[PDB]
């Protein structure tokens with residue numbers, strides 16, 4: 001396979017379905033990427049993550065730089081070898097978790113300085129250091145280091161943060177290109193900023209396209225603005241990005257948000273919702289989410305979802321998983337998480353299939369009717 | 373298969389190797405039974421428990437009667453169906469956990485009354501109720517309800533507790549037999565008591581044999597007396613039990629204790645050590661246990677054990693599992709537990725094979741040399 005190749009097989013409105021070929025594997029789009037925070041998709045062996053249908057997972061740079069360390073992981077052979085996942089891995093730049101997980105956060109044009117939450121140690125992170133850490137991890141899709149904008153944001157602060165992000169996007173690009181092995185085996189995605197302002201989103205898209213990237217993320221959304229506003233911003237923001245490259249919406253994972261985002265041109269998604277809420281007792285179904293801890297499931301012999309094809313729904317009942325979760329049992333988290341991630345992959349499959357068959361708008365309509 | 377059939381294929385000294393045929397499956401002895409406390413072998417799917425080589429698991433009656441309840445489990449189809457384990461399940465009587473997990477413990481000749489630790493509710497447990505609960509669970513090997521003796525114990529208190537246990541053994545036998553479905557599909561094991569006193573152990577063995585059981589457990593050991601004392605008691609206690617029936621040592625699980633116990637005539641074992649210490653960071657190896665949390669394993673690329681055939685040792689390094697455990701990750705517990713239980717099953721296999729080949733004493737000698 002090539003270093004990176006994105007091809008669109010079918011379209012319907014703004015929605016697209018296709019594939020991204022990379023050295024470690026093929027990624028079917030629209031894609032949902034399970035999150036493996038500290039070198040692990042919580043409560044799941046990587047073979048199970050693959051069994052659910054995932055083509056690629058996401059790795060948190062911020063968490064890995066702290067524990068077990070980027071240099072350590074490189075010495076051990078890289079992230080793939082370390083955790084046992086041999087397919088593509090997209091890594092974020094780490095700055096987003098710094099702005100809300102660490103202390104000291106002394107920000108500047110060079111980068112960010114911070115204190116670790118689990119040690120109180122001192123760390124510096126810049127566009128160059130971020131790209132280097134992702135390289136040490138052996139990341140397949142490297143994210144440019146940016147500065148997120150807090151919601152709500154004034155036109156002035158959003159403009160300043162966006163402009164800085166564009167300068168940092170140029171630095172990330174040059175850093176990535178200067179490392180031969182990385183530029184030849186990995187891919188680099190740029191991140192569009194500009195809060196909820198159209199002119200700013202346009203300036204950001206233009207700067208990013210000028211620099212040139214393998215993919216384009218829509219950053220700064222899903223930060224408290226609500227679905228209506230997020231969708232409104234996507235309406236004018238996605239069309240600004242190069243059409244022939246993947247469009248990645250960062251930190252968006254509610255089933256309904258995914259469907260709406262795909263209708264607006266998004267090809268990639270990631271979120272901890274399926275895993276996090278899985279361990280918390282929330283199970284996704286085609287009839288909407290349910291909290292398995294609720295007493296009405298104590299003697300319910302039906303599977304989490306009546307149509308789900310996952311191993312959990314084939315073998316265990318709601319009553320058993322209800323017991324496991326209320327008893328704080330590890331198997332409860334394992335089962336809930338596997339089902340949720342599988343449900344998400346099945347959602348992506350139904351999306352890819354319906355677009356390929358030119359009946360995606362109807363699928364979205366039917367999905368919503370039943371889900372809500 | 374028959375309801376119960378124990379056949380000895382080979383012997384060496386007091387050690388025996390053979391099989392127990394039951395309606396749900398065959399049990400190779402000497403056997404080690406993983407513990408599934410609250411309807412789950414902690415951090416493992418039942419298919420994984422089976423993949424490690426386990427022929428049978430143990431279920432805690434005390435925990436299940438509290439949550440989710442015996443009657444509830446019966447309504448749901450039984451324990452096998454409930455947790456997804458279709459092979460034999462041995463269930464304890466529940467009294468042992470009552471004497472050290474609950475409150476109020478008002479003891480009498482009829483049974484025990486207590487307060488649940490997770491609710492503070494009132495529960496009564498007697499030989500009849502215990503047998504009934506195990507029936508509701510759909511248990512394959514039912515344990516007679518007894519009264520354990522605290523270590524150390526005076527000859528007088530040990531005699532009184534043993535005599536009461538023998539009366540309760542008769543009540544358990546009659547209760548088991550009165551339930552047609554249970555007497556025809558399940559097996560009943562009696563429990564020998566008598567602390568560390570020979571004359572008492574003999575009286576207990578005689579009473580048990582008089583009543584007649586499918587198997588005989590050696591109770592009251594591994595309660596703080598030490599290996600030397602435990603072995604000394606087993607030396608004279610096991611020969612007192614009927615030779616043609618299985619000998620089960622309750623709550624004994626250190627690899628070295630197992631080897632010594634088999635040399636003394638024990639055929640069955642159970643303990644939480646492999647699972648409990650697994651989640652705590654202790655991994656068993658042929659070179660003795662190691663605590664994976666120790667810093668010397670942070671960059672150790674070797675598997676938990678150099679010879680282990682388990683899936684964990686085939687796919688992940690000590691460095692990765694070290695990271696997982698220190699990060700409090702669920703996958704850390706899953707991997708450590710699977711390896712430990714697999715290591716235990718491999719130990720039982722090497723024991724069964726060496727006895728079959730008449731070289732068990734040499735295996736025990738070699739095992740100890742390297743393990744210590």
Ligand SMILES: NCc1c[nH]c2nc(N)[nH]c(=O)c12
Nearest residue numbers: 096148219220221222250251
């Ligand atoms: N929900 C938004 C989001 C999640 N992660 C992110 N990482 C970066 N660099 N930028 C972003 O905007 C975001």
Ligand SMILES: NCc1c[nH]c2nc(N)[nH]c(=O)c12
Nearest residue numbers: 468520591592593594622623
């Ligand atoms: N270690 C001893 C032990 C564990 N579980 C037990 N259960 C019963 N009924 N009796 C016992 O002696 C024991």
Ligand SMILES: [Zn+2]
Nearest residue numbers: 308310313339
């Ligand atoms: Zn499912």
Ligand SMILES: [Zn+2]
Nearest residue numbers: 680682685711
């Ligand atoms: Zn192993």
